[PDB]
Structure 1
Amino acid sequence: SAPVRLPFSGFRLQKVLRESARDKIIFLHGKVNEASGDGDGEDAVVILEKTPFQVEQVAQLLTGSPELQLQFSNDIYSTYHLFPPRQLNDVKTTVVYPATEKHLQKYLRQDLRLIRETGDDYRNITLPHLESQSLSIQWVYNILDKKAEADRIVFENPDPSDGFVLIPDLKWNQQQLDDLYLIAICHRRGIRSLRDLTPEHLPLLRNILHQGQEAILQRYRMKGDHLRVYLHYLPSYYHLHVHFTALGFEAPGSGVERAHLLAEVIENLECDPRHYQQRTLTFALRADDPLLKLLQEAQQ
């Protein structure tokens, strides 16, 4: 059977978590599985995002007879409503079910605040707090165990200590290289973030950088100098992973307040073995995040 259903029965919109006109994305909190009519459904998050244009698809459309509705016109400039064929109309849909209260908070629209976390702040405040406020990494384990997305793996170094799995993300429809996005997940368990990195991890990091880039060149004919390769801090999930993005893709999470180039991570560890245990890291938090209050009050 063609899989054509959401993973639940019925969708009721509880509230809009966040929408962006410039990004053409919307985050939805839904209530599902309410066949009894008691208004007590499970939580689900549904993310909808319009897709980028495909160059040759739009080129063929413009050379024919497109369906247009005139909006504005003045001298050489004019604006239309275009209703394109089915090919240009697909909407990327991401579902989280069952969604946790943590999922509702991370997607709820909030103003951001910057914070600078010393090595001491991490050990005394952040690390104790995140242990109970972290999302499950079962999806990470499923990929490593070949329990999910095995056919989507682009490259794998199977070594338990220095190996990793290279795989597309949730969003990249793989229809164009302009928005290329892949993630590399290390096989070694227990590496929560940059804070756990030591020179012991230099072989792993070099493997991800050089084998990951070569795999992208082999599979997509995408040269290394077309790629932005980095890590997140704070990471979304506390299992070490690296982001491979097209340089021309203004990818979310590539800002300086979250992204750390993998090549510089390697060189920092080579220059100082205790770099990411002692140095201060700067990142952004939601204004109502209790971790922000804990860090702000310890810094007084």
Structure 2
Amino acid sequence: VRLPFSGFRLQKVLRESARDKIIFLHGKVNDAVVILEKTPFQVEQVAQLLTGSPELQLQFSNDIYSTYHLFPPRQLNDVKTTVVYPATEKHLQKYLRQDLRLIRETGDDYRNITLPHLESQSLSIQWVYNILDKKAEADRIVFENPDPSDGFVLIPDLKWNQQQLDDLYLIAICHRRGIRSLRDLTPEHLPLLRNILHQGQEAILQRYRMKGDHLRVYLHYLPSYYHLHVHFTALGFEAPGSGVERAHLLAEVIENLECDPRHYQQRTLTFALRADDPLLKLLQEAQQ
């Protein structure tokens, strides 16, 4: 009934998520990670509490709505506490997560700052080509249009174990090379984009029995690697990644191109960067 160490000095919040009601703490002892997570409610305990006189403090009241701070008895307050002692530097590194900042990249900013900065790094996407010519992961191919210009390869995301449909996640990687991102799309890629959208959906209906209206289909701007690929996710599955600051629906990307051929070269795209990403600093410096 005690911690495996004496005393706890907070050195750094490695990561928090108010959505999941969780925190990851790094504290020195006497190196150790503590993790605190609020628990699910039990229906009967809450219902029992609400027939009575719960300890409440009013936050506000408007018409039929009202909110409060409730301070319930012991039974509902359980915090799942996961300690990690000792902690190597590799444990502290895998929990660390950087604050994100928003950036609004005009078309000119892309050509002058982002693109040059990207060309100065040499992101190897050799792994992608190995999938495309089946040197790697051929067993995982769900569907393929083999057309070198307008085709693609559909594969399940590495983390989706495939044992349920709640969290269905696939990605489509285009066969054609040199499409770095959203920024390179023009009406020329419309047939490719249409193939991914409608053949991708038809593929998933066949393999997994999931209708098209159960699919969020999108690209990421700022993607993690620079060779066009599209995400197909179950709609019921909510993660960061389908957020508006990063996800662009393929269907809408296609319609933008049909209405406005130069949309993705001329228009301003909004995305988030880690606060320590040199690109963030370079875009800021150029915008003031």
**TM-score with structure 2 setting the length:** 0.70
* CA deviations over 1:207-258 (Å, ceiling 9, x no partner): 0000000000000000000000000001110000000000010033110000
Structure 1 residue 201 displacement after superposition: 0.2
Between stretches 246-255 and 207-216, larger displacement belongs to 246-255
Number of matched pairs: 288
2:239 is paired with a residue whose SS is: coil
Look at both structures and tell me which one has the larger radius of gyration over its CA atoms: 2
- In structure 1, the partner of 2:84 is 96
- In structure 1, the partner of 2:167 is 179
Residues 69, 82 of structure 1: 8 Å contact kept? yes
Aligned residues: CA RMSD: 8.3
Structure 1 residue 86 displacement after superposition: 31
Structure 1 residue 204 displacement after superposition: 0.2
Between stretches 12-21 and 273-282, larger displacement belongs to 12-21
In 2: Cα distance, 1:126 partner to 1:151 partner: 36
Between stretches 50-59 and 267-276, larger displacement belongs to 50-59
Structure 1 residue 14 displacement after superposition: 16
Structure 1 residue 54 displacement after superposition: 20
Structure 1 residue 135 displacement after superposition: 3.7
Cα gap change, 1:283 to 1:153, in 2 (>3 Å)? same
Structure 1 residue 93 displacement after superposition: 21
* CA deviations over 1:54-100 (Å, ceiling 9, x no partner): 99999999999999999999999999999999999999999999999
Cα gap change, 1:173 to 1:164, in 2 (>3 Å)? same
2:120 is paired with a residue whose SS is: coil
Cα gap change, 1:75 to 1:265, in 2 (>3 Å)? closer
Between stretches 128-137 and 113-122, larger displacement belongs to 128-137
Summarize the alignment of residues 1-300 of structure 1 with structure 2, pairs less than 5 Å apart: 108-133=96-121, 135-300=123-288
Structure 1 residue 150 displacement after superposition: 0.4
2:11 is paired with a residue whose SS is: strand
Cα gap change, 1:51 to 1:210, in 2 (>3 Å)? farther
Cα gap change, 1:22 to 1:267, in 2 (>3 Å)? closer
The alignment-based identity, stated in percent, is 100
2:166 is paired with a residue whose SS is: helix
Residues 158, 187 of structure 1: 8 Å contact kept? yes
Between stretches 221-230 and 282-291, larger displacement belongs to 282-291
* CA deviations over 1:10-54 (Å, ceiling 9, x no partner): 999999975769769999999999xxxxxxxxx999999999999
Residues 114, 283 of structure 1: 8 Å contact kept? yes
Between stretches 14-23 and 250-259, larger displacement belongs to 14-23
Q: Where in structure 2 are there 5+ consecutive unaligned residues?
A: none
Structure 1 residue 142 displacement after superposition: 1.2
Residues 94, 170 of structure 1: 8 Å contact kept? no
In 1: Cα distance, 2:285 partner to 2:175 partner: 37
Q: Where in structure 1 are there 5+ consecutive unaligned residues?
A: 34-42
* CA deviations over 1:157-195 (Å, ceiling 9, x no partner): 000000000000111000110000000000000100000
In 2: Cα distance, 1:26 partner to 1:148 partner: 38
Structure 1 residue 199 displacement after superposition: 0.5
Structure 1 residue 282 displacement after superposition: 0.1
* CA deviations over 1:95-145 (Å, ceiling 9, x no partner): 999999999999841111001000000000000112233642122111101
Cα gap change, 1:85 to 1:123, in 2 (>3 Å)? farther
Cα gap change, 1:113 to 1:252, in 2 (>3 Å)? same
In 2: Cα distance, 1:213 partner to 1:253 partner: 20
Cα gap change, 1:274 to 1:75, in 2 (>3 Å)? closer
Structure 1 residue 284 displacement after superposition: 0.3
Residues 174, 180 of structure 1: 8 Å contact kept? yes
Residues 114, 282 of structure 1: 8 Å contact kept? yes
Residues 134, 238 of structure 1: 8 Å contact kept? no
Between stretches 15-24 and 143-152, larger displacement belongs to 15-24
In 1: Cα distance, 2:146 partner to 2:5 partner: 35
Between stretches 251-260 and 238-247, larger displacement belongs to 251-260
Cα gap change, 1:121 to 1:9, in 2 (>3 Å)? farther
Between stretches 133-142 and 66-75, larger displacement belongs to 66-75
